[PDB]
Ligand binder design. Structure first.
Ligand code: DHS
Ligand code: DHS
Lengths: 252, 252
């Protein structure tokens, strides 16, 4: 399988990489959070733009990005606007969404952008080519906050993400039973063993799916999310505890 | 489901209980190991009698048990002679095996005894009635050090163990692939959700199955084994790391 080297970090090799989400309401909050996160240990920083209230102005969004970039100029930065249909904080037009993403790619402020699969094939394809031309990596995603589809269906989505040029497919699902957690781990393993030719990120959310956030090295998930102060999705545990379990499982 | 309360410990409720194995070649070794183990934190102590080289004498075996009992009079004590066909250190006659077990039960020195399922139905049934009449609990076991049978076959064995009166069925299997580890977790969940009416202990051995020793609370295994100095079976990790992962997963 291929790996993705962002800055000095190699994704898809070794212990799963830890990603934390920064969530600020405005530039002052973003600024305060970026300075607080400097005292935490993680590998990739994801800025959840949907939590930013001034998304209406491209200049405000780019300015908040520059503030983050200045506080942690070494940390790979993932630019993520999570739409409300997929568990995010806000709803915006596809065109505004694409504009924010192309502008982030253009500015040279971010290392990766998150592009939702169901945005539309033609638009995602176009944005992917744009990201790559600017040397930016694409984490293509899909989230189901209500249930866990079959392993076969999840495997089909991850393969479609690869076909559309995603550098790192990502899928999050909501378990309704412990059985659903096993289905997610199974889909991850089949993906890693037979179809994946690049790093993949998967997770089962909520308390029941917590194990999927820890067993990444065993079943095939190249990165996992932990919480610094507050969680960006249900199930995330503190980064320090997440880091401890990963090392224990890695040196076992 | 029913729980098993050994001393002050409730098995089948809460965080999975940690069991460590004491392995001494002779009375002096057993004595040295028992005093060393006092500085470790675990819930149940399992004495692996098959590692004891003076098993020919019932008096020696009972004397080694009294030494352990005196060093840790509060810790639930599991008496286990593991035959070589199931990964143990020695081979003995069924009659000698039953004699050691009945003598251990008689002495009032142990809280639980391990009885292998494939010893013979009539003998296990008789030894089970004997253990119970003396208020001793039976951990009925089966181990496959070469492969992982189907989930349905594993579920069959665990149910047979319950039918023969086992207080705590236990099954250990060897994974040949990561898929085998998933089969073990699946069998554990099916068992806990549909058939189990008492605590069950399961595990997938080796490095690949390590996750099954950590995810007990999620899938249904009431106890897990950790190593103090040396492992009594492949895959066991240090008790302190095992204890850390269990608490993290428990408070998640
Ligand atoms: C994708 C999924 C998340 C999770 O399940 O941990 C975190 C979000 O911030 C991501 O964008
Ligand atoms: C049963 C199984 C073991 C394991 O797999 O950890 C430990 C042995 O000591 C037991 O008797």
């Amino acid at each position: 399988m291929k790996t993705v080297t962002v800055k000095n970090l190699i994704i898809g090799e070794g212990m799963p990489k830890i990603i934390v989400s920064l969530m600020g309401r405005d530039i002052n909050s973003v600024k305060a959070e970026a300075l607080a996160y400097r005292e935490a240990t993680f590998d990739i920083l994801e800025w959840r733009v949907d939590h930013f209230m001034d998304i209406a102005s491209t200049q405000s969004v780019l300015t908040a990005a520059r503030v983050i970039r200045d506080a942690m100029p070494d940390i790979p930065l993932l630019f993520t606007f999570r739409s409300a249909k997929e568990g995010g904080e806000q709803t915006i037009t596809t065109q505004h969404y694409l504009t924010l993403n192309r502008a982030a790619i253009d500015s040279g402020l971010v290392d990766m952008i998150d592009l939702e699969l169901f945005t539309g094939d033609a638009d995602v394809k176009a944005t992917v080519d744009y990201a790559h031309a600017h040397n930016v990596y694409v984490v293509m995603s899909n989230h189901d906050f209500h249930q866990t589809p079959s392993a076969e269906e999840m495997v089909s989505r991850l393969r479609k993400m690869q076909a559309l040029g995603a550098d790192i497919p990502k899928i999050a699902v909501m378990p309704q039973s412990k059985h659903d957690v096993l289905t997610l781990l199974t889909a991850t393993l089949e993906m890693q063993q037979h179809y994946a030719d690049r790093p993949v990120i998967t997770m089962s959310m909520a308390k029941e799916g917590v194990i999927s956030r820890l067993a990444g090295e065993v079943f095939g998930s190249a990165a996992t999310f932990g919480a610094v102060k507050q969680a960006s999705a249900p199930g995330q545990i503190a980064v320090n505890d997440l880091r401890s379990v990963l090392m224990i499982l890695h040196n076992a």
